[PDB]
Structure formats: C-alpha cells, structure tokens
Amino acid sequence: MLKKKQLTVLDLHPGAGKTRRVLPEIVREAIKKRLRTVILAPTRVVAAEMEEALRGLPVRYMTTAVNVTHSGTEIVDLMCHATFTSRLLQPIRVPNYNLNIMDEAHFTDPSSIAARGYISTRVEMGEAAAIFMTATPPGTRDAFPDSNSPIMDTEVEVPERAWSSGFDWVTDHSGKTVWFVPSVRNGNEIAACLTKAGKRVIQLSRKTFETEFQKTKNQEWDFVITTDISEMGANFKADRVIDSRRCLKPVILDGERVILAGPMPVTHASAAQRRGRIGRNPNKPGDEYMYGGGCAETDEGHAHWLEARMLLDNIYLQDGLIASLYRPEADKVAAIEGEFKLRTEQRKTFVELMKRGDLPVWLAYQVASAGITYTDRRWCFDGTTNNTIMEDSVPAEVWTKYGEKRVLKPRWMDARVCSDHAALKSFKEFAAGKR
Numbered sequence: 001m002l003k004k005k006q007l008t009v010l011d012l013h014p015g016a017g018k019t020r021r022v023l024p025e026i027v028r029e030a031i032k033k034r035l036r037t038v039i040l041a042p043t044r045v046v047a048a049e050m051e052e053a054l055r056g057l058p059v060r061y062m063t064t065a066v067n068v069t070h071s072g073t074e075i076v077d078l079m080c081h082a083t084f085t086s087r088l089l090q091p092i093r094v095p096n097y098n099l100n101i102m103d104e105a106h107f108t109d110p111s112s113i114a115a116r117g118y119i120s121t122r123v124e125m126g127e128a129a130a131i132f133m134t135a136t137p138p139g140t141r142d143a144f145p146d147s148n149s150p151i152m153d154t155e156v157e158v159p160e161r162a163w164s165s166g167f168d169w170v171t172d173h174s175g176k177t178v179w180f181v182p183s184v185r186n187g188n189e190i191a192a193c194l195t196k197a198g199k200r201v202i203q204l205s206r207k208t209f210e211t212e213f214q215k216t217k218n219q220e221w222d223f224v225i226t227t228d229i230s231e232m233g234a235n236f237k238a239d240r241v242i243d244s245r246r247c248l249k250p251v252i253l254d255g256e257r258v259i260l261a262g263p264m265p266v267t268h269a270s271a272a273q274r275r276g277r278i279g280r281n282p283n284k285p286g287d288e289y290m291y292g293g294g295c296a297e298t299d300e301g302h303a304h305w306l307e308a309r310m311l312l313d314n315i316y317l318q319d320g321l322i323a324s325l326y327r328p329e330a331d332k333v334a335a336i337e338g339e340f341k342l343r344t345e346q347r348k349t350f351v352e353l354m355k356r357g358d359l360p361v362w363l364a365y366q367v368a369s370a371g372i373t374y375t376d377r378r379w380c381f382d383g384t385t386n387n388t389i390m391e392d393s394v395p396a397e398v399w400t401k402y403g404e405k406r407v408l409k410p411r412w413m414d415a416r417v418c419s420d421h422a423a424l425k426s427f428k429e430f431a432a433g434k435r
C-alpha cells in the first residue's frame, strides 16, 4: 500500500474492521517507514473514535474534538476531510504528505470530493501514496454487500409523512431503529408522529450531528431519525434500519440558481451504507433492513461535483496546473478544469464566504466572482421577486446592517440557505451583517 505512486481502495465490507483494526496497522507501518501521513475523518465523531483506535500511537489530532497534549514529534496528522480542503484553500502551508489516508472515502460533500481529487492527482503525479477506506467506492452497483451477520432485507412501503394506519410494523418493534429520511423537515414530521405514538426519538443532521449523536450513547432511544450524514461511519447499537431510499439532490438550473430536487432515489453506495448501520454484530443475526424504493445514480449532475471543481480550481498544485477529480467520480459533472479559477482578491472572498459566511460553495462562488466583497450584503436584497425567501408562507424579513427592514430576496437563490428553519436563521444573520 505505502509505496509512492500507489492509490489503494480498501473496500472491505461495512463493519469488516477498516477503522479499528486495519488503520492502526497502516499507521504503525507508516511511522516505521518515516512517511509523513495524514488521516482524514469525515466527522469530529469519527475523529474521536479514531483517537481510541490509535491510542498510544504518536498522532497529532488537528481537531478540538480530542482533548490531548501533542508531543510535537508526531509525523502522522489527523483532521476532518473539510479541514484538509479548508487548509489547502487558505494561505497556510499544508505539508506534502507522503501517505494520504481517507476514512469513509465515499463521503460526497464537496470538500470530501475535492480532497479525493487533490490526493488522487498527487498520486498520479508520482508524488504520494493514498489509501481510500470505504465499503462503497464510487460507481459501486451493490446495495447489499456482505455484513458481519446475516441481515433480513425487505422491500416495503416506508412512510415519509405522519401516518394513522397501514404501518403497524414500524411501531410494533421493541428494538432500536435507525431511520434514514431525505431531509431535516421530513424527519421532523416522522419524529413528531413517533413521539406522539410514545417513542423516544433522536434526530441527526449535518448541523446537529456531533452534539446530538452523543444522545445515542447517553440516553435510551427507540428511533434515530437521520439524514444521509449517518452514512459516514456513524455506529449505533441498533437492530433495524428503515430506509426511505430517498435523498435531496442539489441541482444548478441554467447556471443561475440551485434547487433541492426530489426527494429521489439514493445511490447504490448510499443504500449500502444505510443498510450497513446494522448486521455489524456477528453474535446478533437477523438485524432488519426495510427499504422503501430502488437505487439510481442520482450523483450524476449533482451540484456537489461542480462545487468540488470550484474548490479544486482555487487550490494551488504546481504553477497553473489544477487537480482533477478522482477518476471514478470525474464524469458526474460537465466542467472545464480551471473554469472557476479566481484572481487573488476574489479567491480570498470566495474562501471567506465559505469559512466565515457558511454559504454553500456555489453561492460563495457567485458572490466572489461578481466582484462583491465579503461584508457587502446588498446582493441579499436585490434579487427578482421569484428569489423571495419565504418563512411560514410570508416573505422572510431582516434588519439590514443599515437598520432598514427588508425582504430577503437574494440575487442568487440557493435552496440550501433555507432548506430548514436553522438554515434560514443562519442566512438571515448573514444578510443582516451579523457575521
């Protein structure tokens, strides 16, 4: 694995021990060979579980998720996928790692795709080695891979709305269920229905994941209602998965706006990771996977791959060269390498709109490429009437930084800034000049 110009896909089945058994063996070998190594965790939750699996090995935890005192001698760094891509984009020296390990390397967030593109390009150049750890590499067609114990797979109608009858199997269960929903708002409705039926429910999404995930350990629960974020190495002591088999697809229309299309079918990889939450205990056969639709390759034309190209166009590689997407996922976008390359000041703006602005990549790019500076929020108000953002069926309103009440009507409409109450709250604070 560890020889330069090698990229290895460690594709053992979910629960095969890639993170807790294989990764420490790789890390020990890497330290023996004096390879400057980076380990990329998808989430802070996985970063913390990695510290336990790697404990005693000299690893620098580049995350506040781990409360350790680093010796200063470590040649192995551990950080989140997003932190890697963030540091590449910022005016900060990222070491030229000899070995690049990405855990949960199926993660389809733009920063994860960009990180794979950067790493795979360095390997192709002959500069580095890489290991991508995932049961479900890009283009996998197998939604039902092997497991530690037999799974009961059942195709069944799964509710996506509150229900009164017809789904007794949902509530008759006496164990613990992880339920994959296509959105936060959809999970809110299902969670309310279960809570009304006397169930204890925890809800997980990207913005709440670290905090809320700890509830799965610290309190008794009957259901976890989760978006696709729990595909990224989230482990539950569960005996059933209910999978809508649906997700939202961000789609750029006419190069002009982003909509959240669907819900529509998940990929085979997503379905295999959702299922893969259970069947993990070789002493507990007959965990259940109930699935409510088929799979499709909904990553094709999905905005995250175009957003990854905007990130990679703005990362220095060598002179004017630009990193390519990782070959197996490179056809998922119709993009021209370099088309999103920004001049110095516009690039800095782009980075800050993502890092401090917390705006989606596509929206950050529209603003920066228009020659708008980070603190200039006029664009949040001067869009067409059809870009009016609604709050409970009325136009959303903010007080501008000037103290004027205005309708939120962004010049560029990206549905992710108002996908749920928390998103819209964050975007209101942005339009108001509060960050």
Ligand SMILES: NC(=S)Nc1ccccc1OC(F)(F)F
Pocket (backbone or CB within 6 Å): 060, 061, 062, 063, 064, 066, 068, 069, 070
């Ligand atoms: N525990 C430490 S001293 N970690 C660390 C070391 C070097 C860079 C970043 C780091 O993360 C931090 F900033 F959260 F501490």
